[PDB]
Write a protein that binds this ligand. Structure first.
Ligand SMILES: [Mg+2]
Ligand SMILES: [Mg+2]
Ligand SMILES: [Mg+2]
Ligand SMILES: [Mg+2]
Ligand SMILES: [Mg+2]
Ligand SMILES: [Mg+2]
Ligand SMILES: [Mg+2]
Ligand SMILES: [Mg+2]
Ligand SMILES: [Mg+2]
Ligand SMILES: [Mg+2]
Ligand SMILES: [Mg+2]
Ligand SMILES: [Mg+2]
Ligand SMILES: [Mg+2]
Ligand SMILES: [Mg+2]
Ligand SMILES: [Mg+2]
Ligand SMILES: [Mg+2]
Ligand SMILES: [Mg+2]
Ligand SMILES: [Mg+2]
Ligand SMILES: [Mg+2]
Lengths: 101, 393, 176, 124, 46, 344, 239
RNA sequence: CCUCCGCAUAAGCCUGCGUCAGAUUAAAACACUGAACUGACAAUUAACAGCCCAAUAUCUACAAUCAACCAACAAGUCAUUAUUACCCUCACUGUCAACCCAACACAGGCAUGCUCAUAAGGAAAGGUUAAAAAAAGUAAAAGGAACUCGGCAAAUCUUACCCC
RNA sequence: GCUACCUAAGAACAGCUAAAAGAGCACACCCGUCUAUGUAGCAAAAUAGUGGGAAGAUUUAUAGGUAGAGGCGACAAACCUA
RNA sequence: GCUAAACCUAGCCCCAAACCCACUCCACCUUACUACCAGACAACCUUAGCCAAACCAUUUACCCAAAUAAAGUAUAGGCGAUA
């Protein structure tokens, strides 16, 4: 979940569980050539590799073999008519590699 | 006296508490209720503790309540102990007499022409060249990487003779082993815990070197003592310890009997490298500890003169200079200084080579000395081969 | 499977998907919590597919078939979250008599303003928390003149606003 | 000079500044002596996804459904529809005792259980 | 020689010299921040 | 800038990518034995191999680390593959070499190495630069392998080839319709090293057998946990291909061979790649060293790697004695160690 | 300014300690002393100036063994590493101390004076009158603050009913308690005056900056002054 | 034809010559369509590098310079042990460019590694003519400092003396 | 974040003559003697050539310190954001 | 006939009246906008000067009770500027 306070884990404490997740992802078409088992997603900033793997295998039952992530910097070059820079949002993209061929 | 703690760096005592804490029956009104500091008030806080154990933030109990705390201090010799009066210190701590030359058995074993290596001088020169110049991509290998390499390569070179002597098959070279031997010595509880490079362990024990005649005749020898310096200097005096006289291998181990302990000087820095006398003392004490652990394992915990001595061998190397040692242990009683002493034939300062030029030293575009080892004594490797061949012939 | 990031392949490039009636807060209150959870995940998958379609339409430089579907799903999930939060708030009020399930305190920071400081669930007590004891929740009153200046600036803005309202009303009455 | 207006992110400083800032992801473990990262399974949010095979509730509604007057749920309404019938019955029977409200659904302290309400133990 | 390049950027020096923590560490810097807030500056510090 | 190729890698299907980068064909099983020569002196003294003695030595080296040693710390579940299995591996290799010296005299004069580095640098293919002031210009795809086997054996006389230098196989080397970067692979610029395990002045130029230990990042249990079940043999295959190609290429370039002076004889090497308990064996034959675009237009030669499925040496070692012990794995180890340079 | 002194360690040890330079700056960061800064890096050997200090669980006078005589970059005179019992320490080497010698540290004061070789430490009452002494204290057990430089030496002049009178290298005389310990002989590293710096570079290595180029006119202090010796210094309390 | 360049890392900067469309207009010191641009779309994937460590005592005299002889001074850049605690693991962040500081697409300034002329990287001439004056060179009869405040500059390789 | 000085922890110095070296020739590198150009210039101090040094009192990257009734200064009334 | 020219209304000013503001979730004193760790330091202090005195050297209105008047009076003051 995002924009929420995580309970602080103490040694021996219960398992952290999220029941109504706040993460929404987009399945984007790659802009370059990628291996046949590679699926490209656009995920929120606070999502991690483990979060996306568990998301995919729990909500869509998609077997996942690998996850890599990176942060794309949105352009802060466009100027408004008042010469104020317009910022395109930075986003996070993930490359997942499917599991069983 | 002069004390070494500058108070500009010491801890600062807390500012004196408010005078409201000196009025009986009057309860101060502080900022503990707002859970943050404010410049007008001040709170006393009880000491805090955790109801749960956390290993990343553990705090050990004070030393006196440790279960293994002993009122009398035991003196520990480990791999990093450097004795001041090294050789004499080791002889006193171990109750032993030193012999200048190596035993006659090993030299007789090596003097047989058929017992030599096929091309011994060339093989040893090649091993030196590989350890000192060829072993890495870097121009001049460091001691930390060329000492163990040269020793392991010499061990393999000697191991190559298994076909000529089909009795080296009952050996092995164990790494990451430890000895722990505790003995009383004039009411001084001494303990040696040794952890070095590698030990040759064989399925059979080494034959005794000295005879019972020499063992008996040793009883007139008097251990030299150094008055101003205690024999205990430069040993870790610890009050927390346990008395376990165990070796690194219990029953059922196929190679129980140690053969030779190899002691490396892996240190690029001279102050971190041991001096030759200190290294010799280190190998003397390590061999004594191995022999003592074996003696306790085989012949109980009694302090007695052994009818079957225990022989342990050792060699300490800087990478260029070698020191050889054959140690024979005859007694398990070491509090008294009058009985029969153990024996130690020690050979000191044996160069395998004098210098190595990793690059061609050039003076006015003409080479004066070529790339290779300058000076080479085959007798050092001959002693090495004899020590390896002691157990099997 | 990954086919759930896209709609029925018969709808691909069909320019219209006739569906609507996003969930109403009352209709979601009518349901139970397990049904709410399952419907939340259904709406989550639908929202993911709609976001995927929107991004792909942007890449292809074509209009989105029916963009109002995304708004309907978004507000339906917002209503579901509202219903769950309402039930939780009522239960917390009933059992502990509290709102604002994140503990906090009215404090006064280094600049002299009145803030609502939310707590941060540490593991050691605050009196030996070193980082926490570096924040200052007090004034040091060299800030009082700045407080008065900000108050006067607020008063000036408010007076300008009221005067402008008066002038606009006067003009409106002058014409009509 | 330097860009004062752009938001300070993890891409902007020197090598040490990079890698310390982060992007808002929540930690799932700690760093040990060899820089090795130890993950804690309990610090990773486990997604509680239900079964949807027999679930007949679509993400939209039919237009034929009729409107209803909205009524936000209150603590009073929840009490009236949760505890009032049972406590009315056991007061009419004369068994209601004011001391023990626990068997009506109330609990004195919230520390004992796992999902405590005021400090909001759980996530979402 | 040429003397236009007096600015040799470094984020560490910038944040150490004109940062928020450095401002708040002194009552004078707190008043600098207060002056910025009163004037309505979009950036109170570096 | 060159791609850093890691033999022990977490990349998923790295075996095929390494096959492309190296121009290597892979086949299951050992290379066929050389039955062409006729050993008319079949009756002879022929000192038979002591299977009981070799099994005893192997089990003793196993028990010297796994069931028992005077350990100190715990030892933890991590760093197990370093504290237990690495000493087990080099102990086993040293004892086996010493015991097999009488049967294989080439082992006595060999050089045994512990964790020595081997590097190979080479060029394979080209690309057009897509961005920047060098856009549209052609550049070579450079690769660098920096390996470190747990144990190595180097000899001064080259081994015998397994198949002829022009040996043709109907299967073709896999090709990627994608960039090397997406393996993932990453580029870097540092020193280009061609290193056989020792400098050029060492008489023991050629290689005999490598010994590789899989790191803790690539445990069988971890691969199962990451939902990568059919990825277990891929790491073995990739390690074998990369390490043996690097070793054989360094051996060839130490003889003055390169892309424009390919070879006059094949180069061969062997490898035993293991987890703590599972073992796999590989044979490699470097045929061609001409892998550039210029030198690979009309080149029919391929490098060959032969490999086996990973088999467990033992099974559930517990109670001071090993429960199961596959003697065939130790037989494969000794058979690999018994290979000698061909003599007429 | 954030200045923390390097002299921050509360346990005596033999290994050299890293010492940070100052540049003639106090804790505030301003120049307090001119002409100081930027020499060769140095490490600190800890000198035990309390010459008589018995070990733990031991009380009486003790002997010691000069293990080595070493050069100290932090002082004019050289320093002897000396071991005894089970501990070693650095002390100020006096002249003619070499490795292998034995040194006596004694506390008991005798009815008749004792004969002392050039390296021992006795209470000033036990010493003969007129001996050359060094490393003297002021209170008993205070530790040696006076004569400690290379080649310098002082002389015991008289013994009084409970005190002893000592001449300093500057010829000033001071009386200390009879139980004040001092070491016999002159300090080592003699011929230190004859050292020739040779060039300004050697001064720079030594860590001293050049003098200011500003021309100061001389005042009334500049002429030669012939003053009488200052009065006796007394360190004996009297009610 | 030039190359005293270049390729990386650090630091700095922050999408800043990738694709498509507008090019009717707009900056291109002119233009084609792309370094002085508008909108949309797309990308930098960790092994490299950052981000570390449970306490309480205790230990740590012997530089480096191929470290071996020899030789020093300015005296130096690297080490543990004892007991208790501890069996979960591979997260997060940087990764683009023709680029930074100099108001500029500025003959200026800019740390380290690598080959020290290259396998990198580049273009002094918009076209013409062949005036003066000016700048940078090249060659010059006979003479050889007669110039000039002064052998400044240039060309050749240079003796002796003085002041500070 | 320039610059003056300092502190911590780093880096660089080819080749030849090596007298041993705050030695000599000489790169990189630091500086700026003299000339010419330039003078709203490429440049609010540059360019070309020529020069001084270049294993040291050297040069230099990083972080930190000293501030104006002051700091720092191998005193030039030097420098402390043209 | 090009460049241009022209335009009312955004808002503002001075009064009166009235005492005025600020947590949706998340983050923010460390390098602010950073989920998660053991020295607990801490603020309270007479303005000065320009200027006037035709220089300047004591001195030179400026402070927070509705008005007005007493009154620019009593007083102060290089007895002078002025207060
Ligand atoms: Mg002077
Ligand atoms: Mg002077
Ligand atoms: Mg790049
Ligand atoms: Mg400019
Ligand atoms: Mg080119
Ligand atoms: Mg041109
Ligand atoms: Mg022309
Ligand atoms: Mg022209
Ligand atoms: Mg002429
Ligand atoms: Mg003339
Ligand atoms: Mg004339
Ligand atoms: Mg001239
Ligand atoms: Mg010089
Ligand atoms: Mg020179
Ligand atoms: Mg002057
Ligand atoms: Mg002047
Ligand atoms: Mg005036
Ligand atoms: Mg006037
Ligand atoms: Mg005047």
């Amino acid at each position: 979940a995002r924009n929420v306070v995580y309970p602080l884990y103490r040694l021996g404490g219960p398992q952290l569980r999220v029941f109504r997740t706040n993460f929404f992802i987009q399945l984007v078409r790659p802009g370059v050539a990628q291996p046949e088992d590679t699926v490209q997603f656009r995920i929120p900033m606070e999502m991690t590799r483990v979060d996306l793997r568990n998301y995919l295998e729990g909500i869509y039952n998609v077997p996942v073999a690998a996850v890599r992530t990176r942060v794309q910097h949105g352009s802060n070059k466009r100027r408004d008519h008042r010469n104020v820079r317009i910022k395109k949002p930075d986003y996070k993209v993930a490359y997942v590699q499917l599991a069983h061929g | 006296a002069y004390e070494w703690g500058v108070r500009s760096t010491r801890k600062s005592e807390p500012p004196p508490l408010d005078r409201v804490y000196e009025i009986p029956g009057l309860e101060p009104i502080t900022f503990a209720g707002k859970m943050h500091f404010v410049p007008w008030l001040r709170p006393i806080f009880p000491p805090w503790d955790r109801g749960y154990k956390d290993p990343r933030f553990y705090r050990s109990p004070p030393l006196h309540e440790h279960p293994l705390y002993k009122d009398q201090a035991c003196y520990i010799f480990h791999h990093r102990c450097r004795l001041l009066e090294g050789v004499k210190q080791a002889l006193w701590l171990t109750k032993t007499k030193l012999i200048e030359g190596l035993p006659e058995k090993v030299l007789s074993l090596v003097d047989d022409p058929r017992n030599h290596i096929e091309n011994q001088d060339e093989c040893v020169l090649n091993v030196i060249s590989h350890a000192r110049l060829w072993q890495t991509t870097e121009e001049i290998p460091k001691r930390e990487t060329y000492c163990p390499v040269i020793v392991d390569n010499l061990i393999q070179l000697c191991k190559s003779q298994i076909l000529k002597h089909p009795s080296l098959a009952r050996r092995i070279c164990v790494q990451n082993s430890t000895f722990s031997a505790t003995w009383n010595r004039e009411s001084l509880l001494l303990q040696v815990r040794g952890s070095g490079g590698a030990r040759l362990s064989t399925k059979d024990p080494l034959p005794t070197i000295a005879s019972r005649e020499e063992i008996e005749a040793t009883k007139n020898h008097v251990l030299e003592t150094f008055y101003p310096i205690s024999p205990i200097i430069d040993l870790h005096e610890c009050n927390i310890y346990d008395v376990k006289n165990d070796t690194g291998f219990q029953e059922g181990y196929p190679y129980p009997y140690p053969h030779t302990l190899y002691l490396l000087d892996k240190a690029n820095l001279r102050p971190h490298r041991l001096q030759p006398d200190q290294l010799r003392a280190k190998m003397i004490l390590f061999a004594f500890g191995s022999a003592l652990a074996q003696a306790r394992l085989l012949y109980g915990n009694d302090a007695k003169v052994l009818e079957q001595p225990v022989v342990v061998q050792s060699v300490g190397t800087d990478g260029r200079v070698f020191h050889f040692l054959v140690f024979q242990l005859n007694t398990t009683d070491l509090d008294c200084n009058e009985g029969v002493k153990n024996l130690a034939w020690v050979d000191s300062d044996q160069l395998l080579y004098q210098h190595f030029w990793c690059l061609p030293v050039i003076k006015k575009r003409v080479v004066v000395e070529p790339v290779g080892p300058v000076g080479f004594k085959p007798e050092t490797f001959r002693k090495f081969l004899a020590l390896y061949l002691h157990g099997a012939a | 499977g990954l086919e759930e990031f896209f709609d029925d392949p018969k709808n691909w490039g069909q320019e219209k998907v006739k569906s609507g009636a996003a969930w109403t807060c009352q209709q979601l209150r009518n349901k139970s919590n397990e049904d709410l959870h399952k419907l939340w995940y259904v709406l989550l998958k639908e929202r993911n597919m709609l976001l995927t379609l929107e991004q792909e339409a942007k890449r292809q430089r074509l209009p989105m078939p029916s963009p109002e579907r995304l708004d309907k799903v978004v507000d339906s999930m917002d209503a579901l979250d509202k219903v769950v939060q309402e039930r939780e708030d009522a239960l917390r009020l009933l059992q502990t008599g509290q709102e604002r399930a994140r503990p906090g305190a009215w404090r006064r920071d280094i600049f002299g303003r009145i803030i609502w400081h939310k707590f941060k669930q540490w593991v050691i007590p605050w009196h030996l928390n070193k980082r926490y004891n570096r924040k200052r929740f007090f004034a040091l009153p060299y800030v009082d003149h700045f407080l008065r200046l900000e108050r006067e600036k607020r008063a000036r803005i408010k007076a300008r606003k009221e005067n402008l309202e008066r002038k606009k009303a006067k003009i409106l009455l002058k014409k009509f | 000079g330097a860009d004062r207006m752009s938001k300070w992110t993890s891409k902007r400083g020197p090598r040490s500044f990079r890698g310390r800032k982060g992007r808002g992801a929540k930690g799932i473990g700690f760093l040990t002596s060899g820089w090795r990262f130890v993950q804690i399974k309990e610090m990773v949010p486990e997604f509680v996804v239900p079964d949807l095979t027999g679930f007949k509730l679509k993400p939209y509604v039919s237009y034929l459904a009729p409107e209803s007057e909205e009524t936000p749920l209150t603590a009073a309404q929840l009490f009236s529809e949760a505890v009032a019938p049972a406590i009315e019955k056991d007061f009419k029977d004369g068994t209601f005792d004011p001391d023990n409200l626990e068997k009506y659904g109330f609990e004195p302290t919230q520390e004992g259980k796992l999902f405590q309400l005021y400090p909001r133990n759980f996530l979402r | 020689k040429a003397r236009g390049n007096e600015y040799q950027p470094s984020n560490i020096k910038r944040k150490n010299k004109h940062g928020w923590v450095r401002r708040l560490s002194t009552p004078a810097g707190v008043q600098v921040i207060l002056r910025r807030m009163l004037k309505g500056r979009k950036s109170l510090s570096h | 800038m060159k791609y850093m190729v890691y033999p022990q890698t977490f990349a998923l299907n790295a075996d095929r990518w390494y096959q492309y980068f190296t121009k290597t064909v892979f086949l299951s099983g050992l290379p066929p034995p050389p039955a062409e020569p006729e050993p008319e002196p079949e009756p002879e003294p022929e000192p038979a191999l002591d299977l009981a003695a070799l099994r005893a030595v192997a089990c003793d080296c196993l028990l010297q680390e796994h069931f028992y040693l005077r350990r100190r710390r715990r030892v933890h579940r991590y760093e197990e593959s370093e504290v237990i299995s690495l000493p087990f591996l080099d102990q086993l290799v040293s004892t086996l070499v010493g015991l097999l010296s009488p049967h294989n005299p080439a082992l006595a004069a060999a050089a045994l190495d512990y964790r020595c580095p081997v590097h190979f640098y080479w060029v394979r293919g080209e690309e057009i630069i897509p961005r920047g002031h060098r856009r549209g210009r052609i550049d070579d795809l450079r690769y660098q392998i920096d390996d470190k086997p747990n144990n190595q054996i180097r000899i001064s006389k080259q081994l015998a080839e397994f198949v002829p230098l022009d040996y043709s196989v109907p299967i073709e080397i896999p090709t990627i319709k994608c960039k090397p970067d997406k393996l993932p692979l990453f580029k870097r610029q540092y020193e280009n090293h061609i290193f056989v395990g020792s400098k050029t002045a060492d008489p023991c130029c050629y290689g005999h057998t490598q010994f590789h230990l899989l790191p803790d990042k690539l445990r069988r249990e971890r691969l199962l946990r990451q939902n990568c079940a059919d990825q277990i043999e891929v790491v073995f295959r990739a390690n074998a291909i990369a390490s043996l190609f690097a070793w054989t290429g360094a051996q060839a370039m130490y003889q003055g061979f390169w892309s424009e002076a390919d070879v006059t004889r094949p180069f061969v090497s062997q490898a035993v790649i293991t987890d703590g308990k599972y073992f796999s064996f590989f044979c490699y034959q470097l045929n061609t060293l001409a892998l550039t675009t210029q030198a690979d237009q009309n080149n029919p030669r391929k490098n060959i790697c032969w490999g086996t499925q990973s088999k467990p040496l033992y099974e559930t070692i517990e109670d001071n004695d090993v429960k199961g012990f596959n003697d065939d794995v130790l037989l494969q180890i000794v058979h690999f160690l018994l290979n000698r340079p061909k003599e007429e | 300014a954030n200045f923390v002194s390097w002299k921050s360690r509360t346990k005596y040890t033999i290994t050299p300690v890293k010492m940070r330079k100052s540049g003639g700056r106090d804790h505030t960061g301003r120049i307090r002393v001119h002409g100081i800064g930027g020499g060769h890096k140095q490490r600190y050997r800890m000198i035990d100036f309390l010459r008589f200090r018995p070990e733990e669980t031991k009380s009486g006078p003790f002997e010691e063994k000069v293990i080595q005589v070493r050069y100290d970059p932090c002082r004019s005179a050289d320093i002897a590493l000396v071991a005894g019992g089970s501990r070693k320490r650095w002390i100020i080497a006096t002249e003619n101390m070499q490795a292998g010698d034995t040194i006596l540290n004694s506390n008991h004061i005798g009815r008749m004076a004792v004969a002392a070789r050039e390296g021992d430490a006795h209470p000033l009452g036990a010493l003969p009158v007129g001996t050359l002494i060094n490393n003297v204290e002021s209170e008993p057990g205070r530790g040696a603050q006076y004569i400690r430089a290379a080649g310098t030496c002082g002389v015991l002049l008289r013994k009084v009913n409970g005190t002893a009178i000592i001449q300093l290298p500057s010829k000033r005389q001071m009386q200390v308690l009879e139980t004040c310990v001092a070491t016999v002989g002159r300090v080592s590293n003699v011929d230190h005056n004859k050292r020739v710096i040779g060039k300004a570079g050697r001064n720079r290595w030594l860590g001293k900056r050049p003098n200011s180029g500003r021309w100061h006119r001389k005042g009334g202090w500049a002429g030669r002054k012939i003053r009488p010796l200052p009065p006796m210094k007394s360190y004996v309390k009297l009610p």
